[PDB]
Enzyme design. Structure first.
Site, PDB file in Angstrom:
ATOM      1  N   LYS A  18       1.175  -1.180  -0.030  1.00  0.00           N
ATOM      2  CA  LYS A  18       0.171   0.027   0.108  1.00  0.00           C
ATOM      3  C   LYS A  18       0.882   1.414   0.198  1.00  0.00           C
ATOM      4  CE  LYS A  18      -2.380  -1.253   3.823  1.00  0.00           C
ATOM      5  NZ  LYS A  18      -1.600  -2.266   3.909  1.00  0.00           N
ATOM      6  N   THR A  19       1.931   1.365   0.971  1.00  0.00           N
ATOM      7  CA  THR A  19       2.829   2.566   1.138  1.00  0.00           C
ATOM      8  C   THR A  19       3.497   2.630  -0.124  1.00  0.00           C
ATOM      9  OG1 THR A  19       3.018   2.326   3.508  1.00  0.00           O
ATOM     10  CG2 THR A  19       4.885   3.251   2.002  1.00  0.00           C
ATOM     11  N   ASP A  42      -1.558   6.939   6.325  1.00  0.00           N
ATOM     12  CA  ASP A  42      -1.358   5.530   6.554  1.00  0.00           C
ATOM     13  C   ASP A  42      -2.338   5.351   7.668  1.00  0.00           C
ATOM     14  OD1 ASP A  42      -0.615   2.688   6.091  1.00  0.00           O
ATOM     15  OD2 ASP A  42       0.751   3.162   7.809  1.00  0.00           O
ATOM     16  N   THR A  48      -5.807  -1.379   6.794  1.00  0.00           N
ATOM     17  CA  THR A  48      -5.780  -2.922   6.817  1.00  0.00           C
ATOM     18  C   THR A  48      -7.179  -3.228   6.417  1.00  0.00           C
ATOM     19  OG1 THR A  48      -6.342  -2.877   9.068  1.00  0.00           O
ATOM     20  CG2 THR A  48      -3.771  -2.873   8.494  1.00  0.00           C
ATOM     21  N   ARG A  78       6.364  -8.130   2.039  1.00  0.00           N
ATOM     22  CA  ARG A  78       7.330  -7.799   3.022  1.00  0.00           C
ATOM     23  C   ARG A  78       7.795  -9.238   3.834  1.00  0.00           C
ATOM     24  NH1 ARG A  78       4.635  -4.140   7.397  1.00  0.00           N
ATOM     25  NH2 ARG A  78       5.310  -2.706   6.002  1.00  0.00           N
TER      26      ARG A  78
END
Ligand SMILES: Nc1ncnc2c1ncn2[C@@H]1O[C@H](COP(=O)(O)OP(=O)(O)O)[C@@H](O)[C@H]1O
Length: 298
Positions: A48-49, A93, A127, A186
């Site tokens: 997302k980031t 965020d 999320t 990640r």
């Protein structure tokens, strides 16, 4: 910093999301217009980031990074809204964690452009899209739901990370890591770094299955990619709550962790992989969970 995609062409997987974002992004660029507000939703570590930064980079504007928790008083939101230049990206965020105070102020920047505020693109990340308030959520013209990546996609991200870290890896080995990455880029990348460490200490010329297995044993990651805490969650439900159903707050209390860290960080993959299920009375473990953990099926 070096393993982060700088553009969609470097962003593996999420085909549906990339096509949708690409359509709106390219259009806004060709017309020289401010991109419509975008909401990125999905479990942590899914990019997302990364997409937020790619958006600003493609629009050739500046991105202002911040989060719901940070913005406490309306003063904080004001200083940021006024520092935005035309076409800039305001990335928030954990946007659902915005208090009503700064929330109203932000909404006023969408329903209008003054508290004067230069036209900008709001990119929120969360999320779970449902966590946002009805009003704010509706303000988003583009909503991108990110789901876990496939094993094939993760293997691709792994080979890419391995290449960038100056280390060779065999396909079978990349596959093994992908299968244990819990659907998350990640996680896959961090595992690849740790496996790289093993390769260094054992003095190997390339990452093979043997090296990956040795690394997984050191990291306590089983064949399903579950880590220590994942197993603690399932074991706690099985032993303390007889398999469930157990409510979220009760499970969180027994585990000594915040309810959010459970439902937003660990539960998503356990649900997806079929180890857990949600019912009106709470969470329950499945037969797959009992068998995988070697517990006699009750
Ligand atoms: N599609 C992808 N391809 C390659 N790496 C990715 C991808 N998505 C995420 N990552 C990687 O994973 C890390 C985590 O991503 P990030 O965007 O911060 O996640 P999120 O904001 O959803 O928590 C980044 O290092 C990034 O460079």
């Amino acid at each position: 910093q070096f393993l982060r995609p700088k553009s969609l062409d470097e962003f593996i997987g999420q085909e549906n999301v990339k096509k949708k974002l690409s359509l709106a992004l390219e259009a806004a660029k060709m017309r020289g217009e401010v991109l419509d507000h975008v909401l990125l939703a999905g479990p942590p570590g899914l990019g997302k980031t990364t997409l937020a930064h790619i958006i600003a980079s493609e629009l050739q504007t500046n991105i202002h990074v911040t989060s719901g928790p940070v913005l406490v008083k309306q003063g904080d939101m004001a200083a940021i809204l006024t520092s935005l230049e035309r076409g800039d990206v305001l990335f928030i965020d954990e946007i659902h964690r915005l208090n009503k105070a700064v929330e109203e102020l932000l909404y006023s920047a969408i329903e209008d452009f003054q508290i004067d505020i230069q036209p900008f693109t709001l990119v929120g990340a969360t999320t779970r899209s449902g966590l946002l308030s009805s009003p704010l959520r509706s303000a988003f013209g583009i909503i991108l739901e990110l789901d876990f990546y496939t094993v094939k996609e993760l293997k691709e991200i792994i080979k890419r990370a391995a290449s960038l870290m100056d280390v060779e890896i065999e396909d079978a080995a990349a596959e093994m890591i992908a299968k244990r990455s819990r659907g998350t880029p990640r996680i896959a990348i961090r595992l690849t770094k740790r496996v790289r460490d093993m390769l260094t200490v054992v003095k190997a010329d390339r990452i093979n299955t043997d090296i990956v297995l040795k690394t997984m044993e050191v990291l306590n990651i089983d064949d399903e990619g579950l880590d220590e805490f994942d197993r603690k969650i399932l074991k706690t439900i099985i032993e303390i709550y007889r398999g469930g159903p157990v409510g979220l707050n009760a499970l969180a209390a027994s585990l000594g962790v915040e309810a959010d860290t459970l439902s937003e960080v660990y539960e998503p993959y356990l649900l997806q992989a079929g180890f857990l299920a949600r019912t009106p009375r709470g969470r329950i473990v499945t037969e797959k969970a009992y068998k995988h953990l070697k517990y006699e099926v009750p």
